[PDB]
Design a protein around this ligand. Structure first.
Ligand SMILES: O=C(O)c1cc(O)c2c(c1)C(=O)c1cccc(O)c1C2=O
Ligand SMILES: [Zn+2]
Length: 439
């Protein structure tokens, strides 16, 4: 049978040193009384204000409510995507920013303070890690450049429905074995754990488990976590090892600081993209007579791709969460209004393209060129629309509370003459395909 080790086992420390060395551990004691207080009160403050939410996530094609409740805090405009769900930051106050409710704002400041301290620690541990290998500095600093933390809460008494750990008999899992997605390559992750107050790991206490990827022969590690212990995954650990969370019996919070790989995941980035798409529009005035500067296939393809990007990675992702951030802050209210306007204009662009493709004096070579440059984009738009609407109407989603109910948005009826094109592109895509096979 597969087995596991905790500090009670003779072989624990040396197995740690041999098969999990890039896993570091700083016990509550390395951290000041002061910061412990501030940070814990900050957790309880967010919890009281109802700021943590279960994500209606996706996994092997199945909609599933995560047993754990979460919240994302970080640099303004930043996102972190896991399990097909883009979490938007509730902003903490980096330099250059000034706003979002009192006690909540103060909690954000506090997790920024925590972010700072843990960063300093991570850099020190990676320095040590290298000098241990000795027998760039900018790489280290960018691998500890935490731009977000993902907070988690679970109260096992309230959230009993928990799976047994299958390979090492670690007992009950809060979070099953996984790799953390969407992180900068080789970037560290720093977790502050806070648990509110014989053969194997003690079930009453929280543990983080690690195993080697592909491997259930090498026994796994189960590391006990009390109030205020911190652990760190350094470097390639998150890629070479898997981790899970073993549930104790008391509620527990954690702050999991990460370098989210946000090259296509920031308000700034998606605004530059929308703008790039709108470069193809005549923009003297904002009205519905949409007229484009060019129908070169490359420019049109690009436009429709950006159209999809803002619709499905930004708008539908944001509204699937049914405006639950509105509880914590309004930071994204204006930006999302603006992205919605940019997208509406793009529905305008697509319409103008469909107008061209139907234009009498257009040589069929060129028409077919247009079709072949946009067809993929439009069928992807259709398939992703079926997906999001269904995901918004699924039995599970309809049972969430009213301030969390998924919201299929934007959405308009075929009768709605405010919008230039139907929500259901099925017929249109059929038509374009048919044209493309005309002898
Ligand atoms: O399959 C599961 O039960 C499961 C549970 C989780 O909590 C996570 C995952 C899977 C991920 O895949 C993942 C990826 C990137 C960052 C993350 O934080 C997670 C998770 O947290
Ligand atoms: Zn994880």
């Amino acid at each position: 049978r597969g087995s596991h080790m905790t500090p009670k086992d003779d072989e624990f420390y040396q197995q740690w040193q041999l098969k999990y060395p890039k896993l570091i551990l700083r016990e509550a004691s390395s951290v000041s009384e002061e910061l412990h207080k501030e940070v814990q009160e900050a957790f309880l403050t967010l919890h009281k204000h109802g700021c943590l939410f279960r994500d209606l996530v996706r996994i092997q094609g199945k909609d599933l409510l995560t047993p754990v409740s979460r919240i994302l805090i970080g640099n303004p405009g930043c996102t972190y995507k896991y399990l097909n769900t883009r979490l938007f930051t509730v902003p903490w106050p980096v330099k250059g920013s000034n706003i979002t409710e009192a006690e909540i704002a103060a909690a954000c400041e506090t997790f920024l303070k925590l972010n700072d301290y843990l960063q300093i620690e991570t850099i020190q541990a990676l320095e040590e890690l290298a000098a241990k290998e000795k027998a760039d500095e900018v790489d280290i600093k960018s691998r500890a450049a935490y731009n977000v933390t993902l907070l988690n809460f679970m109260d096992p008494q309230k959230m009993p429905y928990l799976k047994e750990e299958p390979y090492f008999g670690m007992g009950k899992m809060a979070v099953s074995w996984h790799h953390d997605e969407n992180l900068v390559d080789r970037s560290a992750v720093a977790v502050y754990s806070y648990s509110c107050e014989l053969e194997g790991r003690d079930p009453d206490i929280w543990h983080v488990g690690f195993k080697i990827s592909w491997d259930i022969e090498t026994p796994g590690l189960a590391i006990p976590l009390h109030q205020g212990d911190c652990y760190f995954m350094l470097d390639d650990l998150n890629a070479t090892h898997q981790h899970c969370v073993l549930a104790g019996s008391q509620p527990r919070f954690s702050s999991t600081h990460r370098v989210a790989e946000c090259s296509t995941g920031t308000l700034d980035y998606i605004l530059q993209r929308c703008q790039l798409a709108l470069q193809n529009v005549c923009d003297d005035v904002d009205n519905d007579d949409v007229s484009l500067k060019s129908f070169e296939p490359a420019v049109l393809k690009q436009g429709e791709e950006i159209h999809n990007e803002v619709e499905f990675e930004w708008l539908r992702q944001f509204w699937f969460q049914g405006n639950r951030y509105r509880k914590c802050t309004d930071w994204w209210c204006q930006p999302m209004a603006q992205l919605e306007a940019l997208w509406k204009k793009m529905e305008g662009v697509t319409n103008a393209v469909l107008h061209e493709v139907k234009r009498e004096g257009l040589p069929v070579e060129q028409r077919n060129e247009i079709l072949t440059a946009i067809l993929a984009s439009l069928t992807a738009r259709q398939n992703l629309r079926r997906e999001w609407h269904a995901r918004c109407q699924s039995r599970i989603a309809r049972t969430l509370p009213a301030d969390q109910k998924p919201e299929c948005r934007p959405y308009w009826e075929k009768d709605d003459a405010s919008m230039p094109l139907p929500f259901d592109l099925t017929d249109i895509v059929s038509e374009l395909r048919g044209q493309l096979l005309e002898a």
